[PDB]
Design a protein around this ligand. Sequence first.
Ligand SMILES: Nc1nc2c(c(=O)[nH]1)N[C@H]1C(S)=C(S)[C@@H](COP(=O)(O)OP(=O)(O)OC[C@H]3O[C@@H](n4cnc5c(=O)[nH]c(N)nc54)[C@H](O)[C@@H]3O)O[C@H]1N2
Ligand SMILES: Nc1nc2c(c(=O)[nH]1)N[C@H]1C(S)=C(S)[C@@H](COP(=O)(O)OP(=O)(O)OC[C@H]3O[C@@H](n4cnc5c(=O)[nH]c(N)nc54)[C@H](O)[C@@H]3O)O[C@H]1N2
Ligand code: SF4
Ligand code: SF4
Ligand code: SF4
Ligand code: SF4
Ligand code: SF4
Ligand code: SF4
Ligand code: SF4
Ligand code: SF4
Ligand code: FES
Ligand code: FES
Ligand code: FES
Ligand SMILES: [Mo+6]
Ligand SMILES: [S]
Lengths: 243, 949, 234, 148
Amino acid sequence: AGAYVCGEETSLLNSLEGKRGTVRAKPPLPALKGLFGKPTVVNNLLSLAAVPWIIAHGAKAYESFGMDRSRGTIPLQIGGNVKRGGLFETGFGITLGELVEDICGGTASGRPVKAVQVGGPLGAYHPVSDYHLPFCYEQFAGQGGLVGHAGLVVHDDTADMLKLARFAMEFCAIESCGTCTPCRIGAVRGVEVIDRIAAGDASAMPLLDDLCQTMKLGSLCALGGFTPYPVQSAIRHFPADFP
Amino acid sequence: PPLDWTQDMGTPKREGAPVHLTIDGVEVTVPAGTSVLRAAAEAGISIPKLCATDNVEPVGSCRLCMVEIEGMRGTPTSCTTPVAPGMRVHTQTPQLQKLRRGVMELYISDHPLDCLTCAANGDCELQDMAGAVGLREVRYQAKDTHFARRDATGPNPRYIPKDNSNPYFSYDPAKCIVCMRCVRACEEVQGTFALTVMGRGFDARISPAAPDFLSSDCVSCGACVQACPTATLVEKSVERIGTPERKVVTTCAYCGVGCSFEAHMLGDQLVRMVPWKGGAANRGHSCVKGRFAYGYATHQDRILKPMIRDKITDPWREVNWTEALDFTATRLRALRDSHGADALGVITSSRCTNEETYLVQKLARAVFGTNNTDTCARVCHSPTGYGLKQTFGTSAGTQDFDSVEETDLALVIGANPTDGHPVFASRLRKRLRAGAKLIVVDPRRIDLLNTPHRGEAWHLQLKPGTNVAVMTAMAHVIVTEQIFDKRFIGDRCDWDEWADYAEFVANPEYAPEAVESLTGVPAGLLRQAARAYAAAPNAAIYYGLGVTEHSQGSTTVIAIANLAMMTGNIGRPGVGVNPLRGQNNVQGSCDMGSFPHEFPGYRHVSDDATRGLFERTWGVTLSSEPGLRIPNMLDAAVEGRFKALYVQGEDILQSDPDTRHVSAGLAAMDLVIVHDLFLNETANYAHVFLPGSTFLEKDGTFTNAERRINRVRRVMAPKAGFADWEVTQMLANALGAGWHYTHPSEIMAEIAATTPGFAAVTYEMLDARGSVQWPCNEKAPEGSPIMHVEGFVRGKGRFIRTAYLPTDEKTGPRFPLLLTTGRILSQYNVGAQTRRTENTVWHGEDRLEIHPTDAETRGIRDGDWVRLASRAGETTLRATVTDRVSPGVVYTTFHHPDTQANVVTTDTSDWATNCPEYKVTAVQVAASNGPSDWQQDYAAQAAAARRIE
Amino acid sequence: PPLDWTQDMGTPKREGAPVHLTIDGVEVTVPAGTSVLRAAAEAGISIPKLCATDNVEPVGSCRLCMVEIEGMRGTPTSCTTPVAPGMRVHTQTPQLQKLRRGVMELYISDHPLDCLTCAANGDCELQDMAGAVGLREVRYQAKDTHFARRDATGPNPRYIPKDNSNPYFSYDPAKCIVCMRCVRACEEVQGTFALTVMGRGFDARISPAAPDFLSSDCVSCGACVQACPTATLV
Amino acid sequence: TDTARLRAILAAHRGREGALLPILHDVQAAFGFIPEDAYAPIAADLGLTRAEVAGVVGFYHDFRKAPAGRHVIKLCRAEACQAMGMDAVQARLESALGLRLGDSSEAVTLEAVYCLGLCACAPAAMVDDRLVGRLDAAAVAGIVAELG
Ligand SMILES: Nc1nc2c(c(=O)[nH]1)N[C@H]1C(S)=C(S)[C@@H](COP(=O)(O)OP(=O)(O)OC[C@H]3O[C@@H](n4cnc5c(=O)[nH]c(N)nc54)[C@H](O)[C@@H]3O)O[C@H]1N2
Ligand SMILES: Nc1nc2c(c(=O)[nH]1)N[C@H]1C(S)=C(S)[C@@H](COP(=O)(O)OP(=O)(O)OC[C@H]3O[C@@H](n4cnc5c(=O)[nH]c(N)nc54)[C@H](O)[C@@H]3O)O[C@H]1N2
Ligand code: SF4
Ligand code: SF4
Ligand code: SF4
Ligand code: SF4
Ligand code: SF4
Ligand code: SF4
Ligand code: SF4
Ligand code: SF4
Ligand code: FES
Ligand code: FES
Ligand code: FES
Ligand SMILES: [Mo+6]
Ligand SMILES: [S]
């Protein structure tokens, strides 16, 4: 019914139940107690699309693809400013350098790329310098980032990182159940702090850092616990755009 | 004493095995389910919390109770973190200090700095948790705020104007911290889902689906106002007056549930009343009346000086105590010497304490020299004490109200707990929402049936009067089938009588298929309900005035007890036959005499072994004959041989049947004393008047429905200067008795020494333990939460052959419809206490719940004036067409005296206790403009008789 | 145990004969010298007070402990009113409610609303005595204030910057309610007269005769910091 | 013929598990919004309270509180579609119709959707159940041409 926060397992099964999609706390897991208090297995489509293949074609085959920890094939969705967009299904270990400079050419505009955002708006902004970073959960989660549903957009040099860092919080604000404070108020205050940063204030950046940290460590779900990542990444990777 | 009382612990208390954990260097042992926060609380180590309360289940909104745990990544919340063995937690690390500071910063960035000019200063949980963490600066220059009336460039669209619609509390959202302790409480505790969170995110605002609280589905219980930390939802008495300093534990003067309150006091001025989180009757919950309606004590209409008349036609005379008592005693002695001691009588009040009741029954027995005493019990729940006496041996309840927590089925005959006993209905719904099943045998759709998130439910919408036919059919169903417990019967009950009972009930004439014609309930539904009741492991019967107040009340109660005995739903938590007592201390009044056939302790008056003890203790010769009952009193007075009467805390005119006859009998009475707070309907025929005392100025006890003895404390000072027991002893000594009581402790000691059960009762006990069930002797010192746990009281239950007899109040051509009389949540029985409050909003006029199809033919429309042409009188009332009632049935209310409803009521009554037939009366509802010939005369009399000089 | 420990009584305890008096319907027996306020405290009936402490002798500054006494004209102060035999006093009449409201109004008209972000939140005697009396509005649109850093047309001449010279306590006069429980304590209890009231009237400000506390004749005993209700000395 | 439609809808979704959301979808699809005159019957037939039925309607964005215009124009505002110039399309289009983002009217209703799946086709829009991609500054001409 038009809510990005209903993708969370708890909020999802809360929306299924006929109520409003407010994220629940997690003393009980949905597995133990979920839909109508009864155990429920809640999974993504890509995970429930490989199950048949896995059980039929042999699990030992599906384990062949991937790195040491991550095993299997993943689709990489490539959109935004990019010549050859679409979908690339392949095994982990591939560098986004190859995926973004060789496979899918460059940009549609013909300009270079300044940003490559893995994951949705809950994902860091990986620049050209990170082209030597292969696609796997552990290494990306280690190198200050996130790889989820393999989302991958592209931005060229004519993009403003300030606008995007602001959009991040604007999103976290418009998309928010309102259960816990660090997203209720945190986001709509960060959206102001970013404007202040745009103005030129110096008492905003450390303020922003503290806000982001409390958001990370306090927010109930990841919509307000990973929202800081876009911001901090755009700030530490592209400082030539943030006065 | 327990900490759950003084201290607000974080989360609800759980049942489980002992788990040991270390909270910030302090060893702790708590059940497994118990959270980290509650354990830390129990350990003395307090962790900051704003959105977590004991009343409701924890939610991760505040993020202020974060704690660093070894083995867990990040800073998890204690409220939503269940304890584990050997867990070492760190409450206050530097990082956590910083994070909590940040969160409070984000709060206060959207909060007005109206501290120091706000209602909840010193009683706000945001202010102390903002000072606790140590917030020293807010760095967020906020442009988007909810409180700012005027934003840049103009009005703030977020700003929502205050709501003062409800006369008892106000909703200022400008200060709302969305935590939803209002929503959670209204939904989990009260059970009426009238509050929600409209919006998504920062735009989220608490709101009822209506313009104002009053127009919504809010019953005014104040559980949101009690659980709101930040003055958003606030009592108006705290706005007008300052925040209170001290607290005193008292109880409600209503409903017989005995909700234990703490009055918050600022000097002597009662600021507010808030539940105590004590008493198994209410675990921190209440309703409109007890919570808010306490302003009758501070009303201008209250009478504060004695008044003597010498003739009803003559005006009053404000007078001191001495000569008032002198005149009273003189007239009394005259009438006594002339017509005898049996020409007197008293009418005790349940509304009063049990000490005062004891003094009054003494005054009637020792002093006057008669057994002519009585009480409200005689029009309500007197048949109960006959039935449960004939069957079990105790004229009282069988279980507490915590038992319902363990029930698995609830069978409700003739009750409406959503109005009558709201705090019981709350804990009922708490279970109904948790799977338990429900059967409702009322002829009128009750709001308990339409509760939200309800499980299964059956509704036997029968015809008023046929209440024993249905029970008999249930029994026939259970006996023709074989579902009953034979082990239970063979162990706790008798078999030889059971065989006869079964051979009788097994007749195919008392079957559900034959009663459908006279009863009106379907057969299949009835069979299903019976099977469901019999099959369930722990079922429980709750009954009220739909069984007792009829031509056959004791019979119905006996049938119900037969059911409960047969099925095996006795002697265990979750099962029992509970009558829902009404007024406070009805149980205590009945226990302390208040009956013309017994002494304190349900001991008959003809008992020589008892009369001896009492003559020995009082040093006076008593009578062995049972006394008259109110109907008998009035019939006599009409016939003569009855001249005096001392009405204590009762309205014998408005709150009794056949207003005409009772008035005629109250008039032919040389002396009728009145001892109420206000000038009443009964005081229109009075010759004397003695002021009284409220429960705030009193000191003593109340014995509620579950046999619980709650303690009543003095918070104010008597405005008349004397409490009710003081006035009673005044009168008694003025007549010649010679009592000397300076405190009700001596009185309770007397009671203990005289009757058993209260033998171990002492105010110290009541203070320490808090509450006691009156069956408390040297055996069972702590109390008896459950009765008949080990064999019945008489020794063996008794199965009685109940049968359905056609009522004499059948309907005919000129009286086709039927009638019923009931209640509302806002107003109390006669509303002498409640009409003098702001509860005239929800109910300011009594109305007639007629059926639509029974309205079209007559020409009635909602809001029209109609007349109730009955046999025993006539009245006029404002109509209300509703599909709530069945066709050929009507429902009135008696809260307001402007409409004389009990003039329609007939003299027909029960056979044993003569409890009137309030719930059946053949009427005729027609359309009319002129109110009446009776109401006019009543108004005239009341006007010409309530004049003071 | 004694109440002098848990509860801050109004005035110092006096030696004398037993005197019986009725405080708001409560019988009380206290030495002759003992004041109305201390007796009311001993009786459980609390009367609002801000400038009276047990450590020092009472002064009629706050005017918040006013009580209506039979036989006395007007509303006299309990702190400066010695008990008399048979005296019947009324702690809370309507008129007194109104007057106390007015006085707290006049206070808060010159006080910053830094509650909720101040050091003495929950331990301030101005806040609880402002909530106790039941202040709900301030009708004085003040232009002359001590706390406002910037006034109309520029800097406030009354504003005195904070003093953090002493490593143990700080003096923020912006929140001072002149009551002089600091002066009184430093002079009567400690005995080193290092604090005074510089100025006459509204311009009156607590001060030591020196730029900062450290340079003065202050030995750091914290008897001013203990007796300061309103977080000025904290 | 409102009560009739509503009763039919509720009968169609009788006995389901968590049937509030579907019922509300169907209601919105029928009329165009969730009328306040249909908060009560739903609650009754489902055993809920007006409050919850209102909260559910409030939380979710797809449930209109008032009707839209004859036409509707949703326009992504997410990262990808932003990348390839959604702002320009937005400006052009809102100048064409004269209605800013979120600003509705009786003619049209311009709003955000934040994704349509057309991420590769970065500039993406939803005009009256018709998806459109690669919305250059020329396609807007046809967008408005078929959209009076
Ligand atoms: N049509 C119809 N009539 C009925 C009934 C029905 O169901 N339908 N129910 C019957 C039953 S259930 C009963 S309980 C009665 C109840 O109704 P009543 O027996 O009339 O008792 P109350 O409503 O308390 O008011 C009676 C008077 O006592 C005064 N009083 C209250 N508290 C005190 C106190 O602490 N001290 C003193 N000295 N006086 C006090 C009240 O202010 C009031 O003036 O009504 C009976 N009449
Ligand atoms: N707010 C509030 N609380 C109260 C009171 C009040 O007036 N206001 N009254 C107090 C008093 S003293 C009383 S006694 C108690 C008890 O109060 P309850 O036990 O709740 O009794 P009532 O509400 O009078 O009505 C009982 C229900 O059964 C229905 N009924 C009618 N005839 C029959 C019949 O023949 N068979 C069956 N099975 N049902 C029938 C009635 O219509 C009604 O709905 O509550 C106390 N609490
Ligand atoms: S971070 Fe935002 S969306 Fe997530 S649970 Fe908290 S309030 Fe809801
Ligand atoms: S609710 Fe509490 S924090 Fe808010 S203004 Fe009132 S007293 Fe201050
Ligand atoms: S007063 Fe009671 S019923 Fe009304 S909103 Fe508050 S909690 Fe709910
Ligand atoms: S009204 Fe009170 S309890 Fe409800 S969300 Fe707001 S602050 Fe919390
Ligand atoms: S009327 Fe009954 S439920 Fe209400 S507060 Fe009094 S005792 Fe409790
Ligand atoms: S001193 Fe007291 S009243 Fe003044 S700002 Fe601090 S806490 Fe508030
Ligand atoms: S700390 Fe200094 S100024 Fe304060 S009372 Fe002690 S000596 Fe006086
Ligand atoms: S510094 Fe403190 S004690 Fe001294 S006058 Fe000011 S408020 Fe009173
Ligand atoms: S403090 Fe436990 S979550 Fe609010
Ligand atoms: S209160 Fe006694 S004078 Fe300050
Ligand atoms: S992001 Fe707009 S198309 Fe998916
Ligand atoms: Mo009753
Ligand atoms: S009663």
